[PDB]
């Protein structure tokens, strides 16, 4: 037993990480087949970053001006182009460690793993969530740009995030692997800030099902609630409004436990209005919001990856 937030095994993604350098700027790139993907802000220096014409800067750049390091080996870049906020460097060697993969834009509240890298060399992996406000409470130091977030489904790596920047509040913003940002942010050093954030009700509910699945059920009650009434309580406590669509996503977990979502909302309503008193849930004092309905299944079922 025991219940932990787990990252996916990171091997398949580790073999895609390289180091990309343009003059003074070094960051990480993702190497899939014969293409390297990185933040287009690699072609920038100290001042530039403020406000730059990427279209324009890139035009001066030649292939030879990109230094791409995979292990001890320089990859020879033979092409370059820009795609939204990403640079696509074409290289002469197809990455022999290329896993089965796909690019996915994930929705707010959803989770993925992050392989933090510096100079092309992975440092760590953690599990996080895309916040309702389109940021991620990650952990990045300087040099981390180009680090990627992902999920795995069998043999298939689903890339969903590339790191671009840190905001005033110490949280993080980036793109999908198409170079389109999550949220309204832009890749320049201006005065953008995260909007106010809320708690991910869908995930709290999933987590409550997880508690119940592991035999933690003191918090259940014989009552129920309307979607509407729940939202009046949740939102007092800064919870994302729950929707019918969120209700359906919990369907499988509700079926497995035979507890109706609205019955569990009732329980959750009481947790908020009264606290936990002295008890814990899955040995936690707080209501966890970074496990999705699917993480709970994956984990309470011993799902593995080939």
């Amino acid at each position: 037993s025991g219940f932990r937030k787990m990252a996916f095994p990171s091997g398949k993604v580790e073999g895609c990480m390289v180091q990309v350098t343009c003059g003074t700027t070094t960051l990480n790139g993702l190497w899939l087949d014969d293409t390297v993907y990185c933040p287009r802000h690699v072609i920038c220096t100290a001042e530039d970053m403020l406000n730059p014409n990427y279209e324009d800067l890139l035009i001066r750049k030649s292939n030879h001006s990109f230094l791409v390091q995979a292990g001890n080996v320089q990859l020879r870049v033979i092409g370059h182009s820009m795609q939204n906020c990403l640079l696509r460097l074409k290289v002469d060697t197809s990455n022999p460690k290329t896993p089965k993969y796909k690019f996915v834009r994930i929705q707010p509240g959803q989770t993925f793993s992050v392989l933090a890298c510096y100079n092309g060399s992975p440092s760590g992996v953690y599990q996080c969530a895309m916040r309702p406000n389109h940021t991620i409470k990650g952990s990045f130091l300087n040099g981390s740009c180009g680090s990627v977030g992902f999920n795995i489904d069998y043999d298939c790596v689903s890339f969903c995030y590339m790191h671009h920047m840190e905001l005033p509040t110490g949280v993080h913003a980036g793109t999908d692997l198409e170079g389109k940002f999550y949220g309204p942010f832009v890749d320049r050093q201006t005065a953008q800030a995260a909007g106010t954030d809320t708690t991910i009700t869908l995930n709290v509910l999933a987590w409550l099902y997880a508690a119940v699945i592991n035999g933690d059920r003191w918090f259940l009650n014989r009552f129920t609630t309307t979607l509407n009434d729940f939202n009046l309580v949740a939102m007092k406590y800064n919870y994302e409004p729950l929707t019918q669509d969120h209700v359906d996503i919990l369907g499988p977990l509700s079926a497995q436990t035979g507890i109706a979502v609205l019955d569990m909302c009732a329980a959750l309503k009481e947790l908020l209005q009264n606290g936990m008193n002295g008890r814990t849930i899955l040995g936690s004092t707080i209501l966890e919001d970074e496990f999705t309905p699917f993480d709970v299944v994956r984990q309470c079922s011993g799902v593995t990856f080939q």
């Binding site: 802000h41 970053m49 990045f140 790191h163 920047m165 905001l167 993080h172």
Partner: peptide
């Protein structure tokens, strides 16, 4: 904003 900071470009990491």
């Amino acid at each position: 904003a900071v470009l990491x």
